[PDB]
Amino acid sequence: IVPTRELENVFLGRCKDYEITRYLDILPRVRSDCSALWKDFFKAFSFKNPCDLDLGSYKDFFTSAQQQLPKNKVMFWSGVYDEAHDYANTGRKYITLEDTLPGYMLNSLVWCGQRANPGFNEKVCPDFKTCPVQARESFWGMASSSYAHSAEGEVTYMVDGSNPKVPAYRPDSFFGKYGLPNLTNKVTRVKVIVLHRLGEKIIEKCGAGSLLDLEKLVKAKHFAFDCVENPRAVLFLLCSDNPNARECRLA
Amino acid sequence: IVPTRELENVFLGRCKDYEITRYLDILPRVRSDCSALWKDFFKAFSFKNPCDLDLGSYKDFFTSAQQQLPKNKVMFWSGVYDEAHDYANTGRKYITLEDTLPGYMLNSLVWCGQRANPGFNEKVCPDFKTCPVQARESFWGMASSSYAHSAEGEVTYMVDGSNPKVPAYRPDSFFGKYGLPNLTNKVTRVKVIVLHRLGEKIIEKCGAGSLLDLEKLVKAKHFAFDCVENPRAVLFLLCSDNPNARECRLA
Ligand SMILES: NC(=O)c1ccc[n+]([C@@H]2O[C@H](COP(=O)([O-])OP(=O)(O)OC[C@H]3O[C@@H](n4cnc5c(N)ncnc54)[C@H](O)[C@@H]3O)[C@@H](O)[C@H]2O)c1
Numbered sequence: 001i002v003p004t005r006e007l008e009n010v011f012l013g014r015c016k017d018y019e020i021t022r023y024l025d026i027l028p029r030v031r032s033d034c035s036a037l038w039k040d041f042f043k044a045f046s047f048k049n050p051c052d053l054d055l056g057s058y059k060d061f062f063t064s065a066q067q068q069l070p071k072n073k074v075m076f077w078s079g080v081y082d083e084a085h086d087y088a089n090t091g092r093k094y095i096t097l098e099d100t101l102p103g104y105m106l107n108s109l110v111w112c113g114q115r116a117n118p119g120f121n122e123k124v125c126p127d128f129k130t131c132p133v134q135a136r137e138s139f140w141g142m143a144s145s146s147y148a149h150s151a152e153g154e155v156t157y158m159v160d161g162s163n164p165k166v167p168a169y170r171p172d173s174f175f176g177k178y179g180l181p182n183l184t185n186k187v188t189r190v191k192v193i194v195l196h197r198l199g200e201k202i203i204e205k206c207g208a209g210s211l212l213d214l215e216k217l218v219k220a221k222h223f224a225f226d227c228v229e230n231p232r233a234v235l236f237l238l239c240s241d242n243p244n245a246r247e248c249r250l251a
Numbered sequence: 252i253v254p255t256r257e258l259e260n261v262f263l264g265r266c267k268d269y270e271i272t273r274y275l276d277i278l279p280r281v282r283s284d285c286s287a288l289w290k291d292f293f294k295a296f297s298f299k300n301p302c303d304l305d306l307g308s309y310k311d312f313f314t315s316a317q318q319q320l321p322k323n324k325v326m327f328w329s330g331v332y333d334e335a336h337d338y339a340n341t342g343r344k345y346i347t348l349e350d351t352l353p354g355y356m357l358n359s360l361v362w363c364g365q366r367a368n369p370g371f372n373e374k375v376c377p378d379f380k381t382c383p384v385q386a387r388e389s390f391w392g393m394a395s396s397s398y399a400h401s402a403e404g405e406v407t408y409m410v411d412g413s414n415p416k417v418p419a420y421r422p423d424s425f426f427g428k429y430g431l432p433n434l435t436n437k438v439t440r441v442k443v444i445v446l447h448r449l450g451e452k453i454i455e456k457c458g459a460g461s462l463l464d465l466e467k468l469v470k471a472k473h474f475a476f477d478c479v480e481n482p483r484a485v486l487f488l489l490c491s492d493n494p495n496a497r498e499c500r501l502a
Contacts, residue, residue, distance in 0.1 A: 004271065004272070005271055006267065006271055009267045010267060010268060010271050010272060012267075013263065013264035013265065013266070013267035013268045014264065014268050015264075016257065016260045016263075016264035017264040017268060020255065020257055020261050021255070021261060021360070089337075108272060109272070232490075232494035232495075232499075232501075233491050233492070233494050236487045236488070236490040236491035236494060236499070237487070237488070237491045239483075239484075239487040239490075240338075240484050240485075240487035240488045240491065243483035243484045243487060248487070248501075249501065250499075250502055251500040251501060
């Protein structure tokens with residue numbers, strides 16, 4: 001894959017933008033300045049082969065970068081990037097990882113280490129399905145752990161209930177592996193929202209299949225659990241993009 | 252009013268973020284680099300009293316910053332910021348001024364010139380109600396004109412149809428003064444979307460009142476014209492935030 005151009009300039013430009021202007025009434029500022037944060041991010045992978053990473057690599061960066069998160073507002077998602085972010089509505093209804101400082105700075109970017117100066121590969125990065133599991137998941141897995149550990153009160157999890165190749169919930173997704181196990185006693189409830197894509201076969205249902213496995217897990221942690229398929233608020237967002245869909249007919 | 256801190260760093264940070272990562276398949280890049288744009292911008296207002304700006308002050312800045320705009324996707328909005336940006340969908344369905352480079356860079360920011368070094372005031376700015384209209388409007392007014400001038404094909408205009416105190420179309424709004432007067436013959440049609448807020452009394456309707464004045468003005472510019480109230484796709488977006496409103500009942 002093609003690495004992000006001007007990585008340091010982009011990281012630093014997003015960081016300063018976020019610091020001064022973004023999520024001011026939703027998330028707290030971090031103590032560390034943008035240059036300290038860059039130093040922690042870069043040392044996680046620089047001057048190393050591109051797959052020489054593990055879950056501990058970005059430890060200092062995520063420590064510096066972590067924010068206290070709004071109680072009852074944390075959301076996770078798997079398989080539903082646009083619908084989850086459209087619904088969270090840039091922190092107004094829920095926070096996603098990608099609205100927090102480390103998530104916002106690195107969202108959509110591509111980078112990797114190399115041993116030779118300048119310590120990072122400006123030409124090519126591995127498909128990363130290519131590196132071993134602990135390396136491929138080093139950055140977003142630590143991102144997910146740290147974010148989960150900071151969640152408080154009700155947490156929401158949006159999943160795709162219409163994908164015949166990928167269960168709504170799986171033990172090895174970033175949420176499965178780094179989210180749920182890292183929810184603490186500050187969390188009171190996991191609220192699942194199952195998306196049923198308009199015009200598509202329903203594959204997964206609350207109370208059955210992988211959602212029942214998730215339910216059992218949630219309860220084993222002593223959180224409450226609820227699950228809803230296409231709640232009206234989410235259904236109308238879907239309809240907005242597909243207003244003639246059968247599901248959208250009004251009275 | 253307190254000005255944005257670290258204005259230069261914010262502007263440049265936003266400009267680098269946008270250049271490398273934002274609207275990449277939706278809007279073109281600008282030839283000027285971020286440093287050159289900052290110089291143009293700073294030059295427009297600095298070492299002048301804030302009440303001495305006019306519609307020419309940022310002319311050179313907008314000249315450098317102006318992107319060619321995708322045919323048929325240009326949208327104007329009045330009194331409906333959140334609804335218009337949610338519907339426009341960060342450039343995917345429509346472009347707004349706030350998705351373009353200069354609008355993105357200065358959106359929400361607050362700044363002012365001053366006569367002493369360093370030529371701008373980093374700590375306090377005058378409420379703009381104290382200055383002449385042409386100075387209050389010098390930046391966003393030139394922004395809207397430049398943006399209007401670049402529009403081609405069908406343009407869309409989203410208006411509030413449910414304010415008893417503020418007509419859907421006013422000659423003295425930004426669209427009235429800087430948007431419509433500045434549409435060229437590359438524009439073929441103005442399409443009006445009238446927003447009726449859920450649970451509010453309907454004030455304005457297509458073909459009547461200020462909307463008929465606007466219809467007549469558009470036609471006298473030889474643009475085609477159409478007008479809709481709460482088109483399904485827009486209504487569904489409203490409904491997502493108020494699913495239990497009467498207007499949102501499903502079949
Ligand atoms: N913003 C990001 O780039 C990003 C990346 C990973 C994880 N996360 C966080 O963790 C959760 C999403 O991750 P998840 O695994 O639960 O859901 P998911 O399966 O939707 O994965 C999210 C990202 O990981 C990649 N991915 C997913 N399946 C893949 C596959 N089998 N092969 C190769 N790449 C694949 C995709 O690029 C996708 O953008 C969210 O809460 C999110 O905040 C975010």
